[PDB]
Design a protein around this ligand. Structure first.
Ligand SMILES: CC(=O)N[C@@H]1[C@@H](O)[C@H](O[C@@H]2O[C@H](CO)[C@H](O)[C@H](O[C@@H]3O[C@H](CO)[C@@H](O[C@@H]4O[C@H](CO)[C@H](O)[C@H](O[C@@H]5O[C@H](CO)[C@@H](O[C@@H]6O[C@H](CO)[C@H](O)[C@H](O)[C@H]6O)[C@H](O)[C@H]5NC(C)=O)[C@H]4O)[C@H](O)[C@H]3NC(C)=O)[C@H]2O)[C@@H](CO)O[C@H]1O
Length: 143
């Protein structure tokens, strides 16, 4: 059991001890800022560069509110999967939970399953979580 990151500053990048494993649950607890921009992202990536992001989870308070899910490989973005629902709210606290499964990530927001994202690259290669944009973080916890 890895220790939680408590009140990490954004932008944040942090090691996932042992990498993503089938059954690992990562919790991101925080607050979407009220008036500090219109997007944030949680990135599950290989190392610290961010050129290789297995899963980019990117809520955008733009064009009615939607969430982009995508993968970056060797610096190139793939085809976006957009969920045209926004489960977050500017100025409001959230609990965001990611469950790593064999074929996909399951993402719950505030106790409710929000989206799944099927793996495009091997998940075992992911050892870093990064968070950027319009968000303040209280904690990131593991397992
Ligand atoms: C309808 C349609 O088709 N529309 C599309 C749009 O959807 C599309 O928009 C793009 O869509 C994609 C998803 O598909 C994505 O949302 C794009 O957004 C960009 O995404 C990236 C990743 O989240 C952002 O770039 C990253 O930003 C952060 C800060 O916010 C950093 O700057 C990242 O760079 C890394 O920074 C690290 C931390 O500082 C650094 O690591 C550090 O290095 C230090 C030493 O130098 C030290 O060691 C330290 O300890 C260490 O942590 C990394 O080295 C550094 N990496 C690199 C490569 O230098 C950066 O990667 C980006 O901010 C974000 N942009 C926006 C606007 O949100 C989104 O643009 C568009 C465009 O494709 O096309 C339309 O058609």
């Amino acid at each position: 059991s890895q220790a939680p990151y408590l009140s990490p500053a954004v932008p944040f990048s942090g090691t996932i001890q042992g990498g993503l494993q089938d059954g690992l649950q990562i919790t991101v607890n925080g607050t979407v800022l009220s008036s500090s921009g219109t997007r944030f992202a949680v990135n599950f990536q290989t190392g610290f560069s961010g050129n290789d992001i297995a899963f980019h989870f990117n809520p955008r308070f733009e064009d009615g509110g939607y969430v982009v899910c995508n993968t970056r490989q060797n610096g190139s973005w793939g085809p976006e999967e957009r969920k045209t629902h926004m489960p977050f709210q500017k100025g409001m606290p959230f609990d965001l939970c990611f469950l790593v499964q064999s074929s996909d990530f399951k993402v719950m927001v505030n106790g409710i399953l929000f989206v799944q994202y099927f793996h495009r690259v091997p998940f075992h290669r992911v050892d870093t979580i990064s968070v950027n944009g319009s968000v303040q973080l209280s904690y990131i916890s593991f397992q």
